[PDB]
């Protein structure tokens, strides 16, 4: 509910004055309240102040890939009633696999519209814990499915588009739409691997790796997309918990990245974790005091509302710190149109008629269509027009809730691969033959019986929330259970066999890759509510595959080569490396790898430059329409992408760069640009504009400073190195972006 700024008790307070400054309105509201009232409102499940007519407000609300279940959200218990469902989009891993920034922005707009519609019915808050922009650096993280991938630049572009779409633009032009919250600011990418609990895990991260990998996403989020909120994670960095670290929360988030007087929520009772089990403070009150002084403005729990009074009395914190945090929160609320009349807010006029819009359903289907990656095909795909009898088999064959991942809402419909095959008029023989993880072969027979008389076998399996989830990291990155045995038996029939590998993290498909009896292999991840229809549209040829792998499919033995606790990415005497840019082994399928139903010819649409002076680039940086030097351009490629095949398709141009200059070591590759050229009809030649900035070409040294270094740089366009171009930077090395040193 919202206050009554027309007749209620706050009507004569400056907080109810729309003409006044938002920060001044928050100040007027906070000065009107009692210190203890302020304290009992410093938590996510705030009760408001019944004296002044301030209604309750739950800050903990979830909408990762669509309006999700959360403490701040309820869905109508009646299945067909209004607000019983919401557009459940596919997991952000497949969404990053789309590599479509326009699509990500439109999805963010849909999510924000539906969140506003739910809030107008008293069924959702106005701030949402989204997105999760922690890089999926270790292949066996349970929550890496919630993230776009493993590339900090790709995640940066994703989060820029998503924040701008959710919040309603690059600025609160009038009011916010919804307030976002970039998740877990730290080196958080571990749940319980070998007993290392995130709530007691001490991540050791070098400043170089800190600024080069774990923070670019948050810098793009709060500095370039101007987010309204950030969340500090459970883990500790270099011995200090994040929510209690002034260097992480103040020196970087509020200052270097410029969150300013936006509000920082703690991970849910991570403030309590600072005491138990992080052991960091001797008393609980001291834990909450250090958390507050470090920058944590609101606690997702109950630690603040029952300890901050004692902290003020024990002189650990002052009344003014509580008032500062409350002013930040209430100022974001003022910007959300909390204290303004509904007559002047179109976003407050949204209802149930705006939720399951056909545009939203079609956009979810399109996201799934663009996100699925074709890993292998011998020409069996697209399915022959003469194929009529298909056998669908596997633990993912009739997937419905598995298709949603985690942090989801109740979808209006869950179209399974089986249901979609039936929707396309296929004579389907179904059998799930084995579970996700089991040794029971008793279903194999059924599978075989369903497939022995079929024109095509479609095995659909992999992993799901039973294998990877919040609080359960994977121990093996292989096909769980006896799934590979069933695939092998199906391949003994030597029919057209198509294997669908699902789930967030990758599983070792090298056995499938090497077997000639396996004709086609796709990765489906969590394709959302319309996932089956998208997969079948790709199979039949209705939609051409165009997605590309956002993460590396490591071979199995990788789990033995590096511990999940090793936060360093570079190789060494005990590290094969991390991610595509440092890994020294031979991945089964590379980052950015993808197949199409058509062949492409890539050339130059404009002769590329080959020489740049660093000082000239830095000087011209002040004249480009950017506010920070690292956002200024270095150059823009114009690739000519010709469709030399016979099928229309989209193409994802993935501009990679490699240098041997600047700080050693220097990565293999680094995704410095990417674009999605949509719908290239056969024969036609479309132009791909690929823009590289100074911040993506510069190098991060031991000090964590981003600077330009002279020498030879090479750049190519695909994982197959379609075209390549080598230029040189000359002149003197110039610092582009400083870095506050650890306090
Ligand atoms: C808001 O305050 C200003 C003075 O700061 C006053 O002139 C204006 O009338 C007030 N608006 C309302 C709606 O009371
Ligand atoms: C503290 O919070 C409780 C809700 O659990 C509320 O009843 C009480 O009034 C709050 N204290 C003050 C001083 O408002
Ligand atoms: C959802 O709304 C109904 C009535 O609007 C309310 O009674 C119920 O408690 C809400 N659900 C939750 C989980 O708060
Ligand atoms: C950890 O807790 C123990 C008490 O069990 C205490 O003696 C020790 O000083 C603590 N160490 C740290 C680093 O918190
Ligand atoms: C497929 O799943 C749906 C929902 O889980 C269920 O209603 C249906 O019976 C299943 N189909 C088969 C053939 O098991
Ligand atoms: C597929 O598995 C579900 C439970 O996982 C079960 O209800 C269903 O019966 C299975 N399919 C068949 C054909 O038995
Ligand atoms: C399969 O389940 C077992 C527990 O029964 C688990 O230890 C193992 O990690 C799972 N396999 C995979 C590949 O995740
Ligand atoms: O990632 C967060 C998780 O740690 C918490 O337990 O639930 C809310 C999420 O935002």
Author numbering: 1 to 743
Copy the relevant paper text.
Here, to gain a better understanding of fungal xylan degradation systems, which can enhance enzymatic saccharification of plant cell walls in industrial processes, we conducted a comparative study of two glycoside hydrolase family 3 (GH3) β-xylosidases (Bxls), one from the basidiomycete Phanerochaete chrysosporium (PcBxl3), and the other from the ascomycete Trichoderma reesei (TrXyl3A). The xylan main chain is degraded into xylooligosaccharides with low DPs by xylanase, and these products are further degraded into xylose by β-xylosidases (Bxls). PcBxl3 consists of three domains: (β/α)8 domain, (α/β)6-sandwich domain, and fibronectin III (FnIII)-like domain. The relationship between substrate specificity and degree of polymerization of substrates suggested that PcBxl3 preferentially degrades xylobiose (X2), while TrXyl3A degrades longer xylooligosaccharides.
The structure of PcBxl3 with xylose bound in the catalytic center was also determined. The conformation of Glu470 (PcBxl3) is the same in the native and liganded structures of PcBxl3, but Glu492 (TrXyl3A) has different conformations in native and liganded TrXyl3A. For instance, Asp267 in PcBxl3 is located at a distance of 2.7 Å from O2 of the xylose moiety bound at subsite −1, while Arg166 and Asp291 in TrXyl3A are located at distances of 2.7 Å and 2.8 Å, respectively. Glu62 and Lys183 are located at distances of 2.7 and 3.0 Å from O4 of the xylose residue in PcBxl3, respectively, and Glu89 and Lys206 in TrXyl3 are both located at a distance of 2.7 Å from O4. In addition, Trp60 of PcBxl3 and Trp87 of TrXyl3A are located near C5. The amino acids surrounding the nonreducing end sugar moiety are well conserved, but PcBxl3 has Phe129 as the residue corresponding to Tyr152 of TrXyl3A, indicating that subsite −1 of PcBxl3 would be more hydrophobic than that of TrXyl3A. In PcBxl3, there is no clearly detectable subsite +1. In the crystal structure of PcBxl3, subsite +1 was not clearly identified, but that of TrXyl3A was clearly visualized in the crystal structure.
